[PDB]
Amino acid sequence: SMNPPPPETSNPNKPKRQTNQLQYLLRVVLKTLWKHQFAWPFQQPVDAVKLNLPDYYKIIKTPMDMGTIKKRLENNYYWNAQECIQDFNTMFTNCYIYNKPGDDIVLMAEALEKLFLQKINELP
Ligand SMILES: COc1ccccc1S(=O)(=O)Nc1ccc2c(c1)CN(C)C(=O)N2
Ligand code: NA
């Protein structure tokens, strides 16, 4: 039932880059998912305590969320767009691993993932 430390959004010895694809990821891909009606459960690390998911971090070993991704993009944390896309991917996959098909949270993820894949297709 306890919360690990959240994923790092800074790392001084990690090599950083600003690519036009990273800037799109923040301006278009994240900005869009963030405003969606189903974004709220993914805007911060899962709080296993408040949300009574005491098995969450017993099951999910690579947690990720949009609050973390957003800060990482804001902190120029990534080397390339693929690293960032990978964090979105981890976020979705965790949801599908942890919860059951037909859970409301799964239908939420599923709608953001459809939207995500549509906005990523238009990646410059
Ligand atoms: C039943 O609780 C919920 C159902 C749908 C959406 C959100 C909630 S909750 O925020 O009250 N609790 C919740 C319940 C389950 C999850 C999560 C949150 C977050 N998450 C990423 C996950 O994978 N499972
Ligand atoms: Na650098």
Side-chain angles (χ1 to χ4, degrees), residues 2-26 28-30 32-99 101-113 115-124:
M2 205 171 311
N3 285 328
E8 82 191 358
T9 49
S10 272
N11 188 347
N13 285 322
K14 179 173 194 308
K16 316 285 151 42
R17 256 169 49 180
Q18 304 198 46
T19 83
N20 68 305
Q21 289 180 342
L22 278 172
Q23 200 191 56
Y24 180 80
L25 274 163
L26 172 67
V28 176
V29 188
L30 182 288
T32 289
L33 300 209
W34 192 268
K35 285 156 147 272
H36 195 276
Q37 54 181 333
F38 296 161
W40 60 275
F42 312 91
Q43 282 178 159
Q44 59 289 309
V46 175
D47 194 335
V49 183
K50 187 199 197 179
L51 303 177
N52 192 5
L53 307 167
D55 54 357
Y56 187 77
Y57 292 106
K58 293 195 180 299
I59 302 298
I60 302 310
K61 304 313 196 182
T62 312
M64 197 37 65
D65 65 275
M66 294 196 302
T68 299
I69 290 170
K70 170 170 195 297
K71 278 197 160 31
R72 288 175 170 201
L73 284 164
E74 293 178 350
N75 291 344
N76 300 116
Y77 170 92
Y78 300 109
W79 182 251
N80 65 24
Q82 188 57 35
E83 286 188 338
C84 179
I85 285 163
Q86 188 49 53
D87 279 348
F88 277 104
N89 285 350
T90 303
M91 181 183 76
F92 293 124
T93 299
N94 296 338
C95 192
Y96 304 142
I97 287 181
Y98 176 70
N99 311 282
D103 286 354
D104 281 344
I105 187 69
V106 172
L107 308 180
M108 278 168 129
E110 231 133 54
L112 291 159
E113 191 192 7
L115 194 52
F116 180 66
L117 300 151
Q118 157 184 311
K119 294 284 174 162
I120 255 16
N121 219 64
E122 307 311 314
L123 192 60

